[PDB]
Write a protein that binds this ligand. Structure first.
Ligand SMILES: C[C@H]1CC[C@H](NC(=O)Cn2ccnc2)CC1
Length: 330
């Protein structure tokens, strides 16, 4: 089997991407944030504290003839941005782009933190990291991909995120029309539960490539590119007036700037992030200070190849017995 679904930016800055997902019978379609940095499929629901729902579409398990309470199971998750959610668990039929999994754990939120409430466009998350990170207790549950994998034509999914435009998540096949040149594959460590790999270095603009190992994660659920402070300083030093602002919470730059590109290495291959991809717009409405899309990972404890990086590539998440990652230009 295969599936193919369009993923759409939630706003004009590509702050996140949503993908429609069918849950239950009859189908309830929710727009979920596909997150290769986490491993829980959770949704706003009829069980979510009413004051914490503000415009989201909810899953109502009592209206699904295939929903079954997973008795005794609870979940609770916190993310790197400080947001969180928790609740109980159903199993139900879940389909993405024509690919159907029966008995998928659908984690129903009883509580969500303020940032989730405040974002009306995201109805939940669909985790695509390794199932070892799944938070369901006392019986850990599998991701949608983990459940689907054996049925797929090939045990892979691909992320093809757009810049200020829709893109595609495919399951079970590689669309050879969706990228240019060849896909370069690189080793993955699953030891921390992530799609963790080692970039071979970077360049800023038209500058020379610096060969250096940068261990990080391919994370569709993180908006920005988080790299070591040395690398980030080298980038922003090429933008007149750019500075790290403790009050804003990262590097900012004059909105009048033309940003240089940023290149990262995948083996001997190179992925070029155009400068425009690194502009996250005014820090507050009407400001001439703009927020940067490349930020320091110092104090995160891990480098994160988030959407800023991934949207410059066609990315293969290869879930074979020994997982790997593939990157192509597009
Ligand atoms: C320092 C960084 C700050 C931004 C963080 N972004 C997230 O946590 C986004 N997220 C929510 C759910 N899955 C992903 C990542 C760490």
């Amino acid at each position: 089997s295969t599936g193919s679904a369009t993923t759409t930016p939630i706003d004009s800055l590509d702050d996140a991407y949503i993908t429609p997902v069918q849950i239950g019978t009859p189908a309830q379609t929710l727009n979920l944030d596909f997150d290769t940095g986490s491993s829980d499929l959770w949704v706003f629901s009829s069980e979510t504290t009413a004051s914490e729902v503000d415009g989201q579409t909810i899953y109502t398990p009592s209206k699904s003839t295939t929903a079954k309470l997973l008795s005794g199971a609870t979940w609770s998750i916190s993310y790197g941005d400080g947001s969180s959610s928790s609740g109980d668990v159903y199993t139900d039929t879940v389909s993405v782009g024509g690919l159907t999994v029966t008995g998928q754990a659908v984690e129903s939120a009883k509580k969500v933190s303020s940032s989730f409430t405040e974002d009306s466009t995201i109805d939940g998350l669909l985790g695509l990291a390794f199932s070892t990170l799944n938070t369901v207790s006392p019986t850990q549950q599998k991701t949608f991909f983990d459940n689907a994998k054996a049925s797929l034509d090939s045990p892979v999914f691909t992320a093809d995120l757009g810049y200020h435009a829709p893109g595609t998540y495919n399951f079970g096949f590689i669309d050879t029309t969706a990228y240019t040149g060849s896909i370069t594959y690189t080793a993955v460590s699953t030891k921390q539960g992530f799609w963790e790999w080692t970039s071979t270095g970077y360049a800023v603009g038209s500058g020379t490539f610096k060969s250096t190992s940068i261990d990080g994660i391919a994370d569709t659920g993180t908006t920005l590119l988080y790299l070591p402070a040395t690398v980030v300083s080298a980038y922003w030093a090429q933008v007149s007036g750019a500075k790290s602002s403790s009050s804003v919470g990262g590097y900012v730059f004059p909105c009048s700037a033309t940003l240089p590109s940023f290149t990262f290495g995948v083996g001997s291959a190179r992925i070029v992030i155009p400068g425009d991809y690194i502009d996250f717009g005014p820090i507050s409405t009407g400001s001439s200070s703009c927020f940067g899309g490349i930020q320091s990972s110092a104090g995160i404890g891990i480098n994160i190849f988030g959407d800023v990086a991934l949207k410059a590539a066609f990315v293969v998440f290869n879930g074979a017995t020994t997982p790997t990652l593939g990157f192509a230009s597009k």
